[PDB]
Amino acid sequence: FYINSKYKIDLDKIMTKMKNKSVINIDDVDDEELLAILYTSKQFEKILKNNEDSKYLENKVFCSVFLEPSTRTRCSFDAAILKLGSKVLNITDMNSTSFYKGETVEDAFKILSTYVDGIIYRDPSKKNVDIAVSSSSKPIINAGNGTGEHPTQSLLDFYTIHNYFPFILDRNINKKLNIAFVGDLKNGRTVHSLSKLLSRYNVSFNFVSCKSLNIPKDIVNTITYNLKKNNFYSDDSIKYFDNLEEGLEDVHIIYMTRIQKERFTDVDEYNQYKNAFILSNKTLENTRDDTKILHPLPRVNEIKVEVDSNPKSVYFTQAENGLYVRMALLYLIFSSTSSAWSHPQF
Amino acid sequence: FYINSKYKIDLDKIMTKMKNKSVINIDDVDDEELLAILYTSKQFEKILKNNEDSKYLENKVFCSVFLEPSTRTRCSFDAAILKLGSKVLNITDMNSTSFYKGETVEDAFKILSTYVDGIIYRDPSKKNVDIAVSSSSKPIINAGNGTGEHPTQSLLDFYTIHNYFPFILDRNINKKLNIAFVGDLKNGRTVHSLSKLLSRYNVSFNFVSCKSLNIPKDIVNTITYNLKKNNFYSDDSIKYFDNLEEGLEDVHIIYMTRIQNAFILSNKTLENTRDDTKILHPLPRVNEIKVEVDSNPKSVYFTQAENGLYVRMALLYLIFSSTSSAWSHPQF
Amino acid sequence: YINSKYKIDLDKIMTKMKNKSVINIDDVDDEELLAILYTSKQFEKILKNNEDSKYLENKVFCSVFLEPSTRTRCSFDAAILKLGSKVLNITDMNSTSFYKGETVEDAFKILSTYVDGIIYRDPSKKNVDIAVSSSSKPIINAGNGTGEHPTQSLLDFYTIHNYFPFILDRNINKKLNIAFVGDLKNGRTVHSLSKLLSRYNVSFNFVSCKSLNIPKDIVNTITYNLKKNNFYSDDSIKYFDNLEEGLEDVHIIYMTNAFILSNKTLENTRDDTKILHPLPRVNEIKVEVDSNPKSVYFTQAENGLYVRMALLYLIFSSTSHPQF
């Protein structure tokens, strides 16, 4: 098993290590584990695109508990479980208070973990996902919470980037990836998580935003500390812009965020913050030829429909890659054992 | 090898043609495809009634999107997928506005169609099912929308009729089927769709309604056009009544509708019907059919609803199968 | 097929339970109870040893839950899926929004044509029985307003039998004493389990504040069942208003302020006593008790998986049985 032909993956070793691991935070995934996730994700991508048998994890029964609507993420996880050949029981159309009708989170997860092999949990509360992990006799995969931990989104973001720029994994002082993060960097927690993961590599960051909505100082400190630890930190590691023409120059990746109207004082202030960072074929003319455009979605008015036709757009491939990354992570964690012959390989 | 009474079906040829077909409208189903659906539905009926293995389509993962409550239709489709041996993820509980949350229907179906083999979609909006079809990389089956397109309801209605009156398939000038449609023919879109399908055959229509709720003119025009194509149109092809006594006389089929006093069916109103007449109702019923009729052997509305399982299994099998053998098809 | 000493003709008992609806614990007789306990135990050992649990694939069920009861519904879903079968779910509705004008008889006549069996939870008394009349397929009652909840009684009994397997012997010398604590008027889980336990050599302490005592007709049923097997005495049924007296010399404490259980209130219980609670709990049992080896309420909830798998297996199987 090789990825990029450079890095050998002992999937047998790495699975023994990941068996029954809970994944709450992207920091719960180390270098070896990231390689295993990326290799295994790529096998599921090729197997599914070639219409082959995807049933690499068959006899498992999961519970998916989504205590806020997040239909795209929930469907992606359901699809991953079912495509692997396993089964799932769903709790949706509930919130925290109506699901825990008086009962403690500890009691609920202690009991529910006796019924199933694994739990997928989405809850806007941060307190609750951690209480669930303490109480559960079974592995939990966080599908998103209030603190902005959403490891599967970070992992699929990274998988998408590595497919176009596989050199991010090399940690080569000569092969540096430049990414612009555009829009609401205060509230776009998907930026916070992916920045933490990218800062483990030779990466330079453009933060493109307007005053009130800049990247928070704690994320810059984390980026800085991770770049210093691998000797990739310089005066040029982190640049700040308030406009696209400067921000989008000489970047391999443009990652747009959701700009929600609820985040401004009125609709005036919101329509002037869209319009400024709205992406068009015009704003993309003086980007690199190899630039790829990501967006965690849903896209509303941040990227004009005309860009969908532009070969630099990959936000829909990004969403799709979520299926392959969620299948990979479930396979590595919930497999009973491994043997050589049993792993996915196309 | 594949015969429907005495018409031979090249299920292999017909499936090559239906593979990854979307089915939005009963007009998306042609003669050969209708035969394949009827043959295949009948196999699933016999297989399930004899408790044999029904798993003719394993390895598929579907998404079912119901953006209005239609629990009977949703459960029917779920049951069909699961009985075929495939798996499904469900989006229910919701309406158009709460599901799209101001994301476009095109983006939502572009993404969702990357996750699954096929989508079952019910939405009161007519715009939405068509946008979904243009955006989806995967086949869509319309389970009902606002324009009254509901192809699986037409198909199961037709399957039910063909089981009692298999001569409707012959297009023989001497073997004419007479159907009375009773109740709200203006708003009963199930009548509109089935009329379109029935008018492809040697069929005569009684439209039994009050003035305000008659069959609409464009449906009469479509019936007339379809009857003329096969030279089955006459001055006697389409009669209009406002009362059951006259309406229900010499009709092989009585198809009742929800009338949301005059058009209530009872064992009394059934005395001057043919011996062989069968009674359909798309369901749910309120007062249109008195509970006493359930005991009358002419009632088949519950067998009708049951046949929905076998027709939805057939249609999923014919569209989503990725076999390459005649030997692999259902053949009990 | 033995439970250490009773031989089970699982073949004969399944021929009898095939396509049986289970509404009320009285729908389960002695032989059927043995089959459910034997089969439950096989699924317990199979799952704890991570072996293949797929003893019933090829079935498709419908689960209809017309009140929120996420614990019970998930337990049933888990049981169906672990067995290898499939389920279609109708939830997050109530009786009025699900029927929307349509009769219960029409809805179950139709829905029973789609599936091999139905799991039905409805706070209505009348509806589960109408569903049973109308359905062409077996119904398992997952709980209704009349307080019928057979699977809870069965898993309660399974839990007790695991610690005190002598309840099955009907030996005049091997008597089980159970204290029922809290709201015995409204705690219908007490009503059902009392009816089942009274079929055996069992003595009952009813621990309650006056306003919430065990109802007279349940004491009459207990008395009738004890008399039929010649286990009735002046000591068969005691009443207390306090834990000190109630919890003395009882093998089982079943919970549902004076009646808050703590490590303190458990000091002068027998060494072998086990503590049940159908759950969810609020204050009735302090978190400190969870550490006390007498607590089994979480093992109890767990056993619901194995009992619901057993019951579905014995009813829906078309017979190779689970063993070891």
Ligand SMILES: NOCc1ccccc1
């Ligand atoms: N209103 O829903 C009634 C129903 C649901 C499912 C199947 C049959 C009937």
Ligand SMILES: NOCc1ccccc1
């Ligand atoms: N309050 O939710 C408690 C619960 C426990 C186990 C399974 C589902 C729900």
Ligand code: NA
């Ligand atoms: Na499901």
